[PDB]
Design a protein around this nucleic acid. Structure first.
Ligand SMILES: Nc1ncnc2c1ncn2[C@@H]1O[C@H](COP(=O)(O)OP(=O)(O)OP(=O)(O)O)[C@@H](O)[C@H]1O
Ligand SMILES: [Mg+2]
Ligand SMILES: [Mg+2]
Ligand SMILES: [Mg+2]
Ligand SMILES: [Mg+2]
Ligand SMILES: [Mg+2]
Ligand SMILES: [Mg+2]
Ligand SMILES: [Mg+2]
Ligand SMILES: [Mg+2]
Ligand SMILES: [Mg+2]
Ligand SMILES: [Zn+2]
Lengths: 104, 154, 613, 373, 165, 35, 50
RNA sequence: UAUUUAAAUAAUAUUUUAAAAUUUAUUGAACUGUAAUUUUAGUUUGAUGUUGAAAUAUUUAAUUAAAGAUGUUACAGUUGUUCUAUAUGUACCAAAUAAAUAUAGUAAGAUUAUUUUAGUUGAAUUAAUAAAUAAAUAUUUAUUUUUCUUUGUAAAUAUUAUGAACAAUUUAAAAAUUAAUCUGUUUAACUAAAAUGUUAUAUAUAAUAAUCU
RNA sequence: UUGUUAACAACAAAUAAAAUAAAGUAUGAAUUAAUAUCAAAAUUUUAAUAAAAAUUAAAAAAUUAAAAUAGGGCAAGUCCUACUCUCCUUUACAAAGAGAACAUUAUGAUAUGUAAUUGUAUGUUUGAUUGGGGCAAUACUAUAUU
RNA sequence: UCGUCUACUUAUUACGUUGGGUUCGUUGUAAAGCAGAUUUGUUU
């Protein structure tokens, strides 16, 4: 038999880094007022480009070149067009969630 | 499991929850179970009324209650009829008898609850305790309180 | 299309009891109301009522012989009933001694009646003749007659008056006539049926009869005892009307634990000037030291298993039965307990008398009775069989329904290994005396009895078990009124099923709110349907409370003021509350107007829906 | 220490009164036959206050016996009858598990706190409204209403002896606020005034106070009602508050009517709360979770969300120490003015709230008409 | 419905922010060409261009009323709706979306009739970003400033602007 | 006396619940048994 | 259960308009019930004297 | 067993309309339902018309499904649309038509005719063995007994459900005004006469004033 | 102001110009109808809106348009408690339209039973005084015993 | 009656690292206090 503990484990009022990690993994929703797609995609780009993974990120996202900056990466994702930088950030977030960027 | 049936009217005898409510040893601060109204009244509130016989020139407004004993047979200390009309339409105010002061309202009698008797009273005479308009008294309880000398206690 | 009547004022039904609650029942089942709003029309309780009291026995006039009788009975402070009733009876007035169970109601009328006989014997010097007694006592049962004879013998030993009693025996007509021929008596403690037989047989005459005491008068004056007391009192009344013998004003005293319609009307109509001594704030309620416990049994068969648990819980331990000889001896050999005060106080855990009373209080669980500015300890039980055996266990009486259930439970407990004694009327005279003497002396701590042991028995009963839930509160109070006597601790266990769930929920509720068990029955429709004027009273109070809550906490606009006061602050009468269950409390002419509008709008909406489907 | 008192129903209290023998029976002789009960008791107990005697008589602890077999509860104005008894409880009667009224036992003040000149000056400065019965002060942000777990911290309960201008006893706080909430606080000057004003701070149906708040984000509705059910459980070093939409037996309701007065587009809003209940952190919880808009600076509910980067030109979102943008603005009183209207005391907005209002272009000092006078 | 006795309007604070005009026959807004005082002010949620050399491109107005007649006595807060993206990287570049600055209004597309009778219809709605001290974040202005800009309330704006009409 | 179950319900309660008058218990129509 | 339709009487004196009770010298209902009970009891006692 | 005294032998009647499911016998598939044969529409809901050109037309939005039309056959209420449910079986589905004083412990509404000619206006209330007696209301009817005046006493018949919870007091009176102790209310020949009541007093333990410690 | 697309949708402000729907000549219903040639307003009060009373006051006639009042049906809405109905279950209660088995003539058919102890739908399943007491042959006058 | 409480302690050193153990309080009240609701426009 199993007993469930309803309010024992819960993020609640989290920290900045914890909230970024939860939104990047999809645990918490992305709030357009407090926790922006821009900030979480900046966090994803930073944690990816920490090491020499820029060319691999470009290969995963089908980019013609290795991105130098987060804005350049978002613009290239838009070019790969009619979509907006908001849609590009959403695509990057969803790719990181599905694992199209690699195991991390 | 086993179910039985007992009417609530059999338990109504135990409605009061204290000595003050069961034996009426003090003021009923909005906690009264049994009420006594005149046989035939449908709107259950007591009525302290006045008789109007003339215009404000000949008969003053406080002279309507002259048939009642007490302070209504004296002229008040304060008069608010002249000048800006009061927001609550208080026309007169008698002298403070301890912690109680008697006022006279204008217009139809406002239905309030006297904290001493516990009844809803519709009258123009309101006695305010310690200038706090949450605790009001009908004129009958006001006259009785002054008669016994409990003006500074209740 | 079908649309019910929407507008309603009251959907239930009102009882047809116009007089008071439970007007359809007989007085033998239901208790009468003691509120002044109800007793205002009663022929007995609307009249003079004695409520003043006398503090001490020294403040009331008593002869030295009565002073010694009280010291012998170890009684110092009078109980509230004795503080009020002793003075009225000494004034030679027809008195209704009304008091709960175990408050000194017996001595309340025995002291003044005995003193009046002493005054007639010494001051007035009225001679005592052969077949003309002075006082006649009336009791329902045989054990109560023997108990009343015990108390009158303690008083008669000091006062010098001779009391006589008689129950049914073999060759009773012979033995009763010899008593009337051999010894002179002035107190006759007998049954009203038998004393009526002696009067018609001309063995006892109503001459110089000055006092008639009726114990348990609520039942004696009812049809449960064939109106034998009522027929006797009418013969006594015509004796007073007789003006050719010496003027005797025979005063009549009624000792009652209950007040019913029979008692009120038979005394209020026949005794116009009758003083009633009663405290209505304590009359129809159990004692304060009584603990009630209602144990529900899911199956009727499992009732015996629950009873055996209560016996083991209170020390009564059955002997083991493991062999065939012990199984046969369980029903053949009547087993008896053995012990004494010395061994019992060692088991539980001048100076000689103080220690005997200290142990007596610890065993009987005697607590100091608390009256206003007066506290006392309960006197020893006035039973004609003194307890001489003291075994380890709590004493109990198991009240059952009918004789067969009492007999059956008696044999079931014996087969289980319990020392019990059976008591009912079908038993022969020799066995009936032996069975009661076994329990009252201490050889047996379990009494399986019928309702015969429910009225007037002052025994050491630690707790009472209602094996069958009583059908009314009158029997419930009388059964439970055996274990708590004069402030002693008592406990009651009532085993009930679904068939008595209505009265159990009623009694359990009345006890928790500390209310009198008046108007309680087992009919669910009777306990749920109120009277119209009583519903009107509680409705008016509920409306006024909603008005107070509406004024003091709610602010209402002008357009909503009319409807708020219409639904929360207006008393709206009903239309013909007798036929409320038909028209819902609304005039059918108004209902017709309401139904016409709703039906028209319902038909128009239906025609559209049918056309769309 | 009152640690031996127990909850008692009316039945148990009557049973204890019957059992306990700690009673004195004054015999009404010819010399006192005909006197009033209050007069008799005042002459026989000089150490008791009239309030104590009144409470005893009206609650029924003191009664009388007229030799009828029952106790008689009376009013202070009833006359005594000849040869009756007056039953009064003694000192030992209150040593059992039955608590007496407040006037029976005698409390000891003991220590007396010392307030400095600057403390008294700021206490006098915080005064907004003064009356013969009430004093409304402007409690600021960050000042505790009561002494906290750390006894070294200042508090309004410790500054209280500074508002007894001419009275003999210090006032009594009628309602407490959070450490971060700033606004109007009511202090009754008289004991009777406190007893009468306590009725005003229990759960009600019509609101009599306003809370002005600046919340992060604009809710989907301009006005409405919020109703939650809070259950408080003891934690390690705090209280676990469980908010439910459905009532539970161990829960208590929190109700408040909110109106969004003005707001930014979707980044900030100015909201007026009108509560009907008194629950811990009621406004903050109802803003953070019911309205989904955390109050600006409310780090306890929505910590990272309470410091938005949208106001980074005005407030630096990195310090995370800016005061809570929740202010007890306006409160109505039962006392009327000379014009005949109920006196409504208003507190000015704090520095941070005025700064935010001025940066967003909103008027700071505006009368809220939803609470009449 | 507050108050419970006499319910009132819940837009009491909005009335202190909006500049309204009852649409009777004597009181009308009309088009800006009718004369002086006939242009409808900018409501909230209105998009304006940002012509200073800042990272921002479009702003959304927060003010309930915005016009040239009272551009000298009223403060206009706005939120950066759209921000230019620099693929290859100071205070003017640090403009992030969602931030709130004040805006100095430069021109409007609606007709504006001066007191001299000169009507004007500019190409697009225009404004520049400023802080709480009314100091522009940008260093240059890529549009024309209106005559109402010539006021001491916009000292630094006039200094940074290079063309007026 | 009576043996039916709805006898505790008055006419108003019966018509409010929607129950047919139990006093007019008609038996000329058989029960819908599974033939 | 008394007559709701009040009986009318020819008014010969103007005080009959004021009087509510027909026979004011007659005892009330319960009083005359008690009087009848007492008188019948006394008659019964006289009959049973012998 | 039979010791006690009368009489005008005549029977047939007993408001009214309704208050509800029904009993006996038939009918109905031109409406509608299913099977065999010879951009449309349904559902939800808001929005116009509100006795409307319609006793059901038009429109908004969402959602679900899309070979289109007509007629004729078989299935009829105890139930039919071949499981059940909803819905429906010809303009209010307890279907429609024909008979019923069938009957509702019976809810309520009406009930035809002035000038009149006599008693009570809140009592009574005991299920069940030898106890004098229920009371109110109405109709007929019966008792000339003392006295200083006054005094509606009793039978034979008809009906009776108008519905109160606490507290205080009481062998005497709520006299506790936070208490009521309750049956309202209508009732009038004419002309005259006639005895009845609401006024306020604003300063005496008060008010108006000065010296000085 | 929000989307499609390389003009379309609603909206909020100038909701503004501009289009169609008149008296009057004719014909001519229906809901409704206690009623004085109806009574502006204010105040006080009386058994639920009171248009009912009283006191102050002073309220024109005709035509058009307005939902402020009257009028047009309303013991209602939310919460808690208790009882019941409904609905499910079978192992016991009464009926059950289904079937069996048995007796009788035949080992081949139609039926009658006094034989039916089977089952499924339906009715019911909380008024216990139908109890408990008392009465207990041997009268009367006497005798003995424990 | 809208109080407050993610850190102390047994040691270790250095100018933070490593092993163990884990609430306080103001006021009122003794009921005049304690769950939930406190809504009503024939605008049909
Ligand atoms: N004044 C007294 N003080 C102490 N004990 C008393 C007093 N009066 C009587 N008792 C005791 O109370 C016991 C019960 O008395 P009593 O038989 O009168 O009760 P009761 O009311 O007749 O009970 P029931 O109605 O059940 O017969 C007696 O045994 C007696 O010893
Ligand atoms: Mg007894
Ligand atoms: Mg720019
Ligand atoms: Mg067809
Ligand atoms: Mg079918
Ligand atoms: Mg008569
Ligand atoms: Mg008679
Ligand atoms: Mg079956
Ligand atoms: Mg069944
Ligand atoms: Mg509450
Ligand atoms: Zn009062």
């Amino acid at each position: 038999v199993l007993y469930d503990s309803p309010g024992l484990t819960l993020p609640g009022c989290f920290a900045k880094e914890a909230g970024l990690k939860l939104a990047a993994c999809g645990i918490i929703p992305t709030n357009d007022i407090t926790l922006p797609r821009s900030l979480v995609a900046r966090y994803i780009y930073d944690v990816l480009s920490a090491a020499g993974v820029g060319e691999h990120m470009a290969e995963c996202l089908h980019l013609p070149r290795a991105p130098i900056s987060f804005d350049d990466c978002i613009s290239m994702i838009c070019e790969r067009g009619n979509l907006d930088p908001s849609r590009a950030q959403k695509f990057l977030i969803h790719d990181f969630q599905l694992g199209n960027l690699g195991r991390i | 499991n086993i179910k039985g049936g007992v009417g609530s009217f059999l338990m109504r005898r135990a409605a009061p929850k204290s000595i003050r409510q069961k034996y009426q040893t003090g003021p009923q601060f909005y906690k009264r179970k049994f009420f006594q109204f005149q046989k035939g009244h449908h709107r259950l509130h007591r009525r302290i009324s006045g008789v109007q016989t003339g215009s404000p020139t000949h008969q003053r407004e406080y002279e309507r209650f002259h048939h009642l004993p007490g302070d209504v047979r004296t002229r008040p200390q304060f008069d608010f009829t002249f000048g800006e009309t009061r927001a609550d339409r208080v026309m007169f105010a008698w002298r403070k008898r301890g912690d109680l002061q008697l006022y006279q309202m204008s217009g139809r009698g406002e239905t309030f609850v006297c904290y001493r008797c516990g009844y809803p009273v519709r009258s123009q005479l309101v006695a305010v305790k310690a200038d706090n308009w949450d605790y009001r008294m009908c004129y009958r309880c006001y006259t009785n309180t002054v008669h016994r000398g409990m003006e500074n206690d209740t | 299309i079908i649309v019910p009547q929407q507008l309603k004022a009251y959907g239930g039904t009102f009882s047809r009891s116009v007089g008071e609650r439970s007007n359809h029942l007989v007085s033998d089942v239901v208790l009468q109301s003691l509120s002044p709003s109800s007793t205002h029309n009663s022929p007995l309780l609307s009249k003079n009522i004695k409520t003043k009291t006398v503090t001490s026995f020294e403040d009331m006039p008593l002869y030295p012989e009565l002073r010694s009788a009280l010291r012998q009975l170890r009684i110092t402070t009078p109980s509230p009933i004795q503080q009020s009733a002793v003075e009225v009876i000494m004034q030679r007035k027809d008195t209704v001694v009304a008091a709960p169970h175990g408050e000194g109601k017996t001595l309340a009328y025995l002291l003044p009646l005995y003193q009046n006989m002493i005054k007639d014997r010494d001051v007035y010097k009225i001679p005592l003749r052969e077949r003309r007694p002075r006082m006649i006592l009336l009791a329902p049962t045989r054990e109560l007659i023997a108990q009343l004879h015990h108390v009158c013998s303690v008083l008669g030993e000091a006062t010098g008056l001779h009391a006589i009693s008689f129950t049914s025996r073999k060759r009773a007509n012979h033995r009763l006539s010899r008593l009337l021929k051999q010894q002179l008596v002035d107190v006759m403690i007998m049954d009203p049926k038998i004393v009526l037989r002696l009067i018609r047989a001309r063995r006892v005459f109503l001459d110089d009869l000055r006092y008639v005491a009726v114990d348990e008068a609520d039942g004696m004056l009812s049809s449960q005892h064939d109106h034998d007391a009522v027929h006797l009192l009418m013969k006594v009344q015509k004796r007073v009307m007789f003006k050719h013998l010496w003027p005797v004003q025979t005063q009549t005293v009624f000792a009652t634990a209950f007040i019913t319609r029979k008692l009120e009307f038979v005394v209020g109509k026949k005794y116009p000037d009758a003083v009633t001594c009663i405290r209505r704030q304590r009359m129809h309620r159990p004692p304060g030291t009584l603990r009630h416990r209602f144990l529900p049994v899911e199956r009727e068969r499992e009732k015996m298993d629950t009873l055996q648990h209560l016996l083991k819980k209170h020390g009564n331990r059955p002997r083991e039965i493991l062999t065939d000889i012990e199984e046969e001896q369980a029903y053949s050999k009547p087993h008896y307990l053995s012990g004494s005060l010395e061994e019992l106080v060692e088991l539980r855990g001048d100076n000689a008398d103080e220690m005997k009373e200290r142990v007596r209080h610890a065993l009987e669980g005697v607590r100091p009775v608390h009256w206003e500015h007066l506290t006392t300890v309960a006197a020893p039980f006035t039973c004609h069989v003194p307890r001489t055996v003291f075994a380890d266990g709590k004493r109990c009486i198991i009240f059952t329904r009918g004789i067969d259930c009492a007999t059956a439970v008696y044999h079931r407990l014996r087969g289980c290994g319990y020392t019990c004694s059976l008591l009912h009327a079908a038993l022969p005279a020799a066995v009936r005396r032996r069975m009661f003497a076994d329990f009252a002396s201490g050889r047996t701590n379990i009494l399986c009895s019928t309702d015969v042991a429910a009225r007037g028995l002052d025994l050491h009963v630690d707790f009472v078990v209602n094996f069958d839930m009583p059908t009314n509160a009158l029997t419930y109070l009388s059964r439970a009124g055996r274990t708590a006597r004069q402030g002693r601790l008592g406990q009651v266990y009532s085993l009930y099923t679904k068939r008595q769930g209505v009265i159990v929920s009623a009694v359990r509720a009345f006890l928790q709110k500390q209310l009198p068990l008046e108007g309680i029955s087992n009919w669910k429709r009777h306990m749920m349907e109120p009277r119209y004027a009583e519903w009107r009273t509680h409705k008016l109070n509920a409306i006024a409370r909603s008005y107070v809550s509406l004024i003091t906490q709610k602010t209402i606009p002008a357009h909503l003021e009319r409807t708020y006061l219409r639904h929360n602050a207006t008393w709206r009468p009903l239309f013909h509350p007798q036929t409320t269950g038909v028209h819902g409390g609304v005039p059918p002419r108004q209902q017709q107007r309401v139904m016409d509008a709703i039906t028209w709008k319902a038909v128009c909406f239906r025609r559209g829906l049918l056309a769309r489907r | 220490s009152h640690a031996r008192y127990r909850p008692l129903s009316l039945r148990a209290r009557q049973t204890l009164s019957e059992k306990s023998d700690d009673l004195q029976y004054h015999v009404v002789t010819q010399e006192w036959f005909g006197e009033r009960v209050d007069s008799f008791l005042t002459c026989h107990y000089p150490q008791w206050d009239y309030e104590t005697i009144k409470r005893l008589v009206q609650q029924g602890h003191i009664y009388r016996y007229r030799k009828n077999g029952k106790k008689k509860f009376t009013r202070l104005t009833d006359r005594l009858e000849f040869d009756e008894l007056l039953v009064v409880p003694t000192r030992a009667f209150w040593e059992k598990q039955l608590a007496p009224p407040s006037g029976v036992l005698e409390e000891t003040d003991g220590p007396k706190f010392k307030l400095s000149a600057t403390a008294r000056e700021m206490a006098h400065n915080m005064v907004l409204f003064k009356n013969e019965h009430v004093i409304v002060i402007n409690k600021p942000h960050g000042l505790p209403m009561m002494p906290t777990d750390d006894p070294q911290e200042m508090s309004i309960a410790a500054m209280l002896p500074a508002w007894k201008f001419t009275n003999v006893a210090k006032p009594v706080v009628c309602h407490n606020l959070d450490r971060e909430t700033s606004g109007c606080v009511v202090l009754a000057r008289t004991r009777n005034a406190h007893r009468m004003l306590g009725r005003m701070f229990v759960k009600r149906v019509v609101p009599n106070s306003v809370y002005w708040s600046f919340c992060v984000g604009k809710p989907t509705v301009n006005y409405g009602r919020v109703r939650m059910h809070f259950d408080i459980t003891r934690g390690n070093k705090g209280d676990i508050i469980v908010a439910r939409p459905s009532p539970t037996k161990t829960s208590k309701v929190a109700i408040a009517e909110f109106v969004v007065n003005a707001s930014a587009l979707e980044f900030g809003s100015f909201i007026s709360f009108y509560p009907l209940t008194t629950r811990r952190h009621q406004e903050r919880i109802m803003a953070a979770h019911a309205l989904r808009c955390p109050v600006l600076g409310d780090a306890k509910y929505g910590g990272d969300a309470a410091f938005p980067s949208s106001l980074s030109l005005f407030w630096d979102p990195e310090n995370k120490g800016l005061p809570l943008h929740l202010h007890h603005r306006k409160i109505q009183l039962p006392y009327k003015n000379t014009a005949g209207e109920f006196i409504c005391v208003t507190a000015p907005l704090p520095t941070q709230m005025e700064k935010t209002f001025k940066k967003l272009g909103w008027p700071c000092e505006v009368d809220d008409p939803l609470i009449p006078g | 419905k507050l108050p419970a006795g006499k319910p009132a309007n819940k837009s009491w604070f909005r009335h202190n922010l909006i500049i309204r005009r009852k649409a009777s026959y004597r009181s009308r807004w009309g088009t800006g060409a009718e004369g002086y005082g006939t242009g409808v002010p900018f409501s909230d949620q209105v998009k304006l261009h940002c012509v200073d050399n800042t990272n921002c491109k479009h702003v959304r107005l927060i003010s309930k009323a915005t016009a040239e007649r009272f551009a000298h006595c009223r403060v206009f807060p706005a939120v950066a709706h759209r921000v230019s993206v620099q693929r290859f990287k100071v205070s003017r570049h640090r403009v992030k979306p969602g931030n709130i600055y004040w805006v100095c209004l430069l021109s409007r597309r609606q007709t504006n009739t001066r007191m001299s009778g000169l009507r004007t219809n500019f190409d697009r709605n225009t404004c520049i970003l400023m802080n709480d001290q009314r100091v522009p974040l940008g260093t240059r202005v890529m549009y024309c400033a209106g005559r109402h800009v010539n006021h001491k309330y916009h000292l630094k704006a006039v200094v940074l602007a290079n063309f007026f009409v | 006396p009576h043996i039916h179950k709805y006898r505790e319900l008055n006419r108003w309660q019966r018509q409010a619940q929607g129950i047919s008058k139990w006093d007019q218990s008609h038996s000329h129509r058989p029960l819908p048994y599974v033939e | 259960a008394f007559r709701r339709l009040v009986k009318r009487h020819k008014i010969t004196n103007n005080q009959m308009l004021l009087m509510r009770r027909r026979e004011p010298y007659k005892p009330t209902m319960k009083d005359r019930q008690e009087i009848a009970d007492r008188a019948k009891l006394e008659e019964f006692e006289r009959k049973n004297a012998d």
